[PDB]
Amino acid sequence: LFHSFDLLVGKDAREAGIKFEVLLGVYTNAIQYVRFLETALAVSCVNTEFKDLSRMTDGKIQFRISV
Amino acid sequence: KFEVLLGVYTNAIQYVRFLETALAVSCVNTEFKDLSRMTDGKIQFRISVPTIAHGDGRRPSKQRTFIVVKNCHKHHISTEMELSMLDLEILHSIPETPVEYAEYVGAVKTVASALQFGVDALERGLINTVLSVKLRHAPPMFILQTLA
Amino acid sequence: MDLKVVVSLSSRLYTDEIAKMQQRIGCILPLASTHGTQNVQGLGLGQVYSLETVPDYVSMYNYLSDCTLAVLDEVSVDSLILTKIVPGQTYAIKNKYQPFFQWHGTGSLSVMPPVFGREHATVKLESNDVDIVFPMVLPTPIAEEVLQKILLFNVYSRVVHMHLGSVSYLGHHYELALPEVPGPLGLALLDNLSLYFCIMVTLLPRASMRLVRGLIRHEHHDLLNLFQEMVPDEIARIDLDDLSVADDLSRMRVMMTYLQSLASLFNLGPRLATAAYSQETLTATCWLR
Amino acid sequence: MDLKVVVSLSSRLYTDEIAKMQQRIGCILPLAQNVQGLGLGQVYSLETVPDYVSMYNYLSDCTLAVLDEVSVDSLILTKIVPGQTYAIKNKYQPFFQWHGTGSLSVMPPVFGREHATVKLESNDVDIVFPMVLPTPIAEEVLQKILLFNVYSRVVMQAPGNADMLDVHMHLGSVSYLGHHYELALPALLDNLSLYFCIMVTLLPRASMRLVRGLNLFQEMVPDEIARIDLDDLSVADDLSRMRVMMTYLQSLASLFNLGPRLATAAYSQETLTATCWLR
Amino acid sequence: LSEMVAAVSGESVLKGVSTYTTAKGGEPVGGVFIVTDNVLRQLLTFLGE
Amino acid sequence: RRRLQRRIAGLLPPPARRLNISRGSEFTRDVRGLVEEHAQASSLSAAAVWRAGLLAPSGWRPPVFGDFLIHASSFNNAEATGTPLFQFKQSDPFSGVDAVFTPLSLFILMNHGRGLTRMANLLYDSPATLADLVPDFGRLVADRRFHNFITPVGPLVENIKSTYLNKITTVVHGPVVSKAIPRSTVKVTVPQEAFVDLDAWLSQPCPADARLYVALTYEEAGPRFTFFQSSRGHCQIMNILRIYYSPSIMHRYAVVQPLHIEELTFGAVACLGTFSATDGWRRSAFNYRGSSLPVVEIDSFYSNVSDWEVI
């Protein structure tokens, strides 16, 4: 039954074996797993997959503001 | 979630029978199936004593005869087997879910072990009370060395 | 175990009598026999308490002590059904008695002869010539003073008596009827009390007189208010003796046994030990003590 | 039937409290569910004067309970019924042997408050258990504390008639079935003593009124010092004296009925318990 | 040695098949006597076989 | 095992009835089973008497028993079963022997020092050893404290035989029945010349039961034992026996000294048990090897011993 307790206790069922001895109730906590796209401050940020940030060694980005 | 917790159990029992021990060499066992109704027992020995005809003038023992009885010793053997009714009310039902088939056969393995420890206890008590009958009617050896 | 008496009428119960008996459901009734089907002539306390003779309550106390008790659960035409009271079962008893004593303290109750009058609990059957009187159920602190008023009226018939005639409660005062003659068995109980007192008067101690003398002359308790600052002379002439401990110890052992015998004498009538009384539902879960 | 009564502990119990509750697990205690008025601890509080008679009336009114299991938040206890029995034990620090006595009496502990108590620092209540003791010991300690209260208040008022060591030699020890116990004799027990005192003072005029109610037969048995009281007393004073005396006599007789009188069958001195039913 | 085997052998949980048999006799082996080499030499001239 | 399984399976409590309120089709068959259970547990058939043996665990109570360790010479093997035994309080703390008395061996403790006496001294011929069991009889009856040192322990239900240091078992509280599961009724045996019916000396309400009271009483020649059968209560039979004890109040008058507190008590009454009033006590005759005395036979006893209350 979901384990391998055949060689541990033995083959005979009248000498040894397994027995239901308590029904314990545990409560696993439900945790919300958040993502950056599922949350709503992704409206503010247009986010991209650069995937190798060592390719950009220059810290400065040139802004060409045309009026 | 309600995890069913299995627990191991070992019936640490050696099956002794009264007819498998050599103590039953000293007994003629019969199975009187209604001894709880017998109130007395009896066995009569009528012993006819012979004599010797003698030459000199003696008062002769004219055909002596002893009739003795032996009443039976009666003693009961009682064990007290508990059986939890939490494990009993799931015996009359039927399993249809794996939790009920997990606990139903786990109750069967408890009540069958309580039955095979109730017969074994009576067999051990039978051997013990046969040995106690033998020890109560056992005179010591320093007395029987000369009284026999 | 079926514990249910079906007391059957011979004649037809009229509608006003059905309303008067439906007004009294849950009240204690004493039965003649303990069996499953009985007759009305013999139900209740009317066979010992009749209109023709004097109200003698001490024989009613011994009747309530001897015979069984039952509560009234269902009343219908030609028959009214009762439930017996055995030890080991908890019964619901409602307060439907006309001199209302509130059971706020959940004290132990007591079953009484109808000392407050017949005609409020007389409830009358014109079907058959019988009168069902319901015994008064009330706590034992009221019951001891009602029994002492019954016992004291007969000795104070000779020599203010309205205080002994009525009852005292926290909220109200109710009038209970006293006879001019108690009866044969009430006179027997008063005779046994008189013999007990005339024997036990010589077996009283001597040391407590010195206590009451020094306490009167020294320190007034609230309990020392009855003497009105006065001591008699009998106390003095029994205080012309010296105090020892051995004769007083034997006298207090025989005083213990005599006070136990007086506890046996005063404890008359059945008592019910209440548990978890509901004031809003007005019923009480009780069993026989 | 289902008889497991639980009580509501507010604060969790610490280790020494667990040990002191385990020490007296077999004893009985009354009941009022609230842990505040859980037993006799509201009469033995520091709030009220420790009066004996109100304690007795509360002990005879409310039900009793023998407790089975103790925990850090619960108190498993079964209340008493007149039907069946419970196994109770003698776990009282004034130890009285229950050897073969067929009756047990439940009285308030007159051997001091500290002797039969558990003081809970963490909680709101300090519980006490009543004295469960055999009935000749019960009536003997009633005699030897009642007469000691009388013979003590007398020598507090006038120490010329009696002696304190003379009453402390005999009135401080009980001797039942060969066991010799000592009494912790130190307020307490004063109202019962003065009740008995009022009873035996007014009982001469009570006996005279009773023998005049119904002749020289019952007037011979008083002695000459026990007979003479003059025949002049007011009607209202005599009636109120008789009523108050008979009230105190009834209360004192039901009080010297020692309350809930338990009965036992098989006292097992190896395990200190006896099969106990209510009687 | 028989007194050691008698004093060791009692009740024990979790039993099963006859494990660790010998080959000549086919008898199940009850235990093991861990000894030193000098005691191993001495228990084969005392016991002999 | 098959005999044991067939014996346990019949002696089993029936399961409680379920009503699944949640499901639809299960509620109908469960109330079907409910009405099929009532209709065969109420009607006149063998099914309604089959239901009474299951006992469904308030009505039945297995009683308590008193294992007492006695001497064989202080007892007799030939007595009947239902004899109300009276344990004596022992002064030594660690004693081990609980000296009980049958009413005949206590009748020879009565008479030796001053019918019933014939069978009494036929059952207990030598009374010197039984006077040596009690440490003090005459002084303890002189200060009249004998009634509290004698406690009743209910009727004997099982006497296992032993030549020295006998052991008896009495029902101290509960329904009087035997110990061996081959079942029989323990009929309470009381000798008749000690037994009086109180309606006979009284010469109107039907009770539930008629109780049996023993009254150790202090007659001026010696103690006396009388078994009183009363349909009334305890505090009522105190008053009724106050009526019955008419010359005792004259003797306690005619011993005029009040400081001698010995003659101011006249015995005490203890309630033994409750047998049914609708079935009265049966008369019977108990035979020894030579003699036969008439003995009251009392069945359906429920033993509950009360305290000795002073007359």
**Which three-class secondary structure string do you get for chain C?**
CCCCEEEECCCCCCHHHHHHHHCCCCCEEECCCCCCEEECCCCCCCCCCCCCCCCCCHHHHHHHHHCCEEEEEEEECCEEEEEECCCCCCEEEECCCCCCCCCCCCCCEEEECCCCCCCCCCCEECCCCEECCCCEEEEHHHHHHHHHHHHHHCCCCCCCHHHHHECCCCCCCCECCCCCCCCHHHHHHHHHHHHHHHHHCCCCCCHHHHHHHHHHHHCCCCHHHCCCCCCCCHHHHHCCCCCCCHHHHHHHHHHHHHHHHHHHHHCCCCEEEEEEECCCCCEEEEEEC
Q: Identify all chain A residues contacting B7, using CB atoms and an 8 Å cutoff.
A: 18-22
- Find the helix packing angle between C184-200 and C140-153, rounded to 10°: 90
Residue B95 is encoded by which pair of tokens? 């399993």
CB contact under 8 A, A16 and E15: yes
Do D197 and C208 contact (CB within 8 A), yes or no? yes
Contact of E13 with chain A, judged by CB distance below 8 Å, is answered with: yes
Task: Give F82→chain C minimum CA distance, Å.
Answer: 26
Do C108 and D61 contact (CB within 8 A), yes or no? yes
CB contact under 8 A, D209 and C87: no
CB contact under 8 A, C62 and F232: yes
Kindly list the strands in the beta sheet with C109-112, ordered across the sheet, starting from the edge strand earlier in the chain.
Answer: C91-94, C283-288, C271-277, C109-112, C136-139
**Cα nearest neighbour of B8 on chain E:** E14
| Out of C66, C202, C254, closest to residue F231 by CB | C66
**Cα nearest neighbour of F15 on chain B:** B89
CA distances (Å), E7 to each of B14, E4, E10, E15, F3, in order? 19, 5, 8, 19, 40
Do C226 and D198 contact (CB within 8 A), yes or no? yes
> Considering only residues 16 to 55 of chain A, which have any Cβ-Cβ distance to chain E shorter than 8 Å?
16
Helices (H), F191-247: 198-202, 234-244
Residue B112 is encoded by which pair of tokens? 């069958």
CA distances (Å), D56 to each of B147, D79, D108, F209, in order? 73, 19, 7, 33
What is the Cα–Cα distance from F198 to F213, expressed in whole angstroms? 11
Q: Which residues pair with F169 in a beta bridge?
A: F67, F158
Which residue in A26, A14, A20, A15 sits closest to A1, CA to CA? A20
Neighbours of A46 (CB within 10 A): 6
> Considering only residues 67 to 86 of chain F, which have any Cβ-Cβ distance to chain D shorter than 8 Å?
67
Q: Identify all chain E residues contacting A15, using CB atoms and an 8 Å cutoff.
A: 15
| Chains near E (3 or more Cβ pairs under 8 Å) | A, B
Phi, psi for residue F249 in degrees, rounded to 5: -75, -20
Contact of F276 with chain C, judged by CB distance below 8 Å, is answered with: no
Which residue is associated with the tokens 């009334």?
A: F232
| Out of B37, B85, B118, closest to residue F4 by CB | B118
CB contact under 8 A, F90 and D100: yes
**SS3 state at E14:** coil
Q: Check the CA dihedral F90-F93-F95-F97 and report its sign.
A: positive
Do B110 and B87 contact (CB within 8 A), yes or no? yes
Best A6, A9, A14, A18 member to test E by mutation, with max E CBs in 10 Å, is A9
| Out of C30, C62, C203, closest to residue F258 by CB | C203
Q: Which residues pair with C112 in a beta bridge?
A: C136
Pairing of strands C5-8, C37-39: parallel
| Out of B1, B8, B102, closest to residue A16 by CB | B8
Task: Give A39→chain B minimum CA distance, Å.
Answer: 30
Which residue in F4, A22, E14 sits closest to B112, CA to CA? F4
Which residue in C260, C285, C279 sits closest to C200, CA to CA? C260
Residue C184 is encoded by which pair of tokens? 């044969």
What is the Cα–Cα distance from B102 to B98, expressed in whole angstroms? 6
Best F38, F173, F242 member to test C by mutation, with max C CBs in 10 Å, is F242
Task: Give D128→chain F minimum CA distance, Å.
Answer: 28
Q: Do chains A and E touch (3 or more CB pairs under 8 A)?
A: yes
Which residue is associated with the tokens 């002999």?
A: E48
Which residue in D59, D36, D44 sits closest to C108, CA to CA? D59
Residue F99 is encoded by which pair of tokens? 């000296």
> For chain F, what is the largest distance between any 2 Cα atoms, rounded to a whole number of angstroms?
87
Q: Do chains C and D touch (3 or more CB pairs under 8 A)?
A: yes
Which technique was used to obtain these atomic coordinates? cryo-EM
CB contact under 8 A, B76 and F1: no
Residue F78 is encoded by which pair of tokens? 């030939």
Do D98 and D177 contact (CB within 8 A), yes or no? no
Which residue is associated with the tokens 């017969």?
A: B119
Q: Identify all chain F residues contacting B116, using CB atoms and an 8 Å cutoff.
A: 1
Do F265 and F310 contact (CB within 8 A), yes or no? yes
| Out of B6, B13, B116, closest to residue A20 by CB | B6
Which residue in D171, D139, D111, D81 sits closest to D255, CA to CA? D139
Residue F128 is given by DSSP the state H
**Cα nearest neighbour of F257 on chain D:** D221
Q: Identify all chain B residues contacting E11, using CB atoms and an 8 Å cutoff.
A: 12
**Cα nearest neighbour of E12 on chain B:** B12
Contact of F231 with chain C, judged by CB distance below 8 Å, is answered with: yes
What is the Cα–Cα distance from C115 to C136, expressed in whole angstroms? 8
What is the Cα–Cα distance from D5 to C209, expressed in whole angstroms? 49
Task: Give A37→chain E minimum CA distance, Å.
Answer: 56
E strands present in chain F:
64-69, 84-88, 150-160, 167-175, 188-191, 195-197, 209-218, 223-230, 268-276, 282-287, 292-298, 302-304, 309-310
| Chains near A (3 or more Cβ pairs under 8 Å) | B, E
Task: Give F101→chain B minimum CA distance, Å.
Answer: 26
| Chains near B (3 or more Cβ pairs under 8 Å) | A, E, F
> Considering only residues 190 to 249 of chain D, which have any Cβ-Cβ distance to chain C shorter than 8 Å?
191, 193-198, 200-204, 206-207, 209-214, 218-219, 221-223, 225-226, 228-229, 235-244, 246-247, 249
> Considering only residues 30 to 59 of chain A, which have any Cβ-Cβ distance to chain B shorter than 8 Å?
none
Q: Identify all chain A residues contacting B9, using CB atoms and an 8 Å cutoff.
A: 16-19
Best C1, C34, C38, C254 member to test F by mutation, with max F CBs in 10 Å, is C34
CB contact under 8 A, E14 and A8: yes
Do C229 and D237 contact (CB within 8 A), yes or no? no
| Chains near D (3 or more Cβ pairs under 8 Å) | C, F
CA distances (Å), C196 to each of C58, C258, C275, F243, in order? 18, 8, 36, 14
Do C185 and C218 contact (CB within 8 A), yes or no? no
Measure the CA dihedral B135/B136/B142/B148, to 10°.
Answer: -100
Q: Which residues pair with D151 in a beta bridge?
A: none
If residue D133 lies in a helix (H) or strand (E), which one and from where to where? strand D131-134
Deposited resolution, Å? 3.8
CB contact under 8 A, C148 and D246: yes
**Cα nearest neighbour of D222 on chain F:** F258
What is the Cα–Cα distance from C84 to C181, expressed in whole angstroms? 34
Residue F86 is encoded by which pair of tokens? 């009276």
CB contact under 8 A, E17 and A16: no
Question: Per CB distance under 8 Å, which residues of F are interface residues toward B?
Answer: 1, 4-5, 8, 12-13, 15-16, 180, 182
If residue F116 lies in a helix (H) or strand (E), which one and from where to where? helix F116-123
Phi, psi for residue B10 in degrees, rounded to 5: -130, 115
Which residue in F272, F260, F256, F268 sits closest to F305, CA to CA? F272
**SS3 state at F258:** coil
How many Cα atoms occupy the beta-carbon half-sphere of F277 within 13 Å? 19
Contact of E17 with chain A, judged by CB distance below 8 Å, is answered with: yes
Residue E43 is encoded by which pair of tokens? 């228990």
Do D86 and D78 contact (CB within 8 A), yes or no? yes
**Cα nearest neighbour of A1 on chain B:** B102
Contact of B85 with chain E, judged by CB distance below 8 Å, is answered with: no
What is the Cα–Cα distance from C20 to C27, expressed in whole angstroms? 13
CB contact under 8 A, B92 and F15: yes
If residue D16 lies in a helix (H) or strand (E), which one and from where to where? helix D15-23
Interacting residues of F29 by C-beta distance below 8 A, sequence separation 6+: none
What is the Cα–Cα distance from D82 to C90, expressed in whole angstroms? 11
CB contact under 8 A, F258 and C202: yes
Q: Identify all chain E residues contacting B11, using CB atoms and an 8 Å cutoff.
A: none
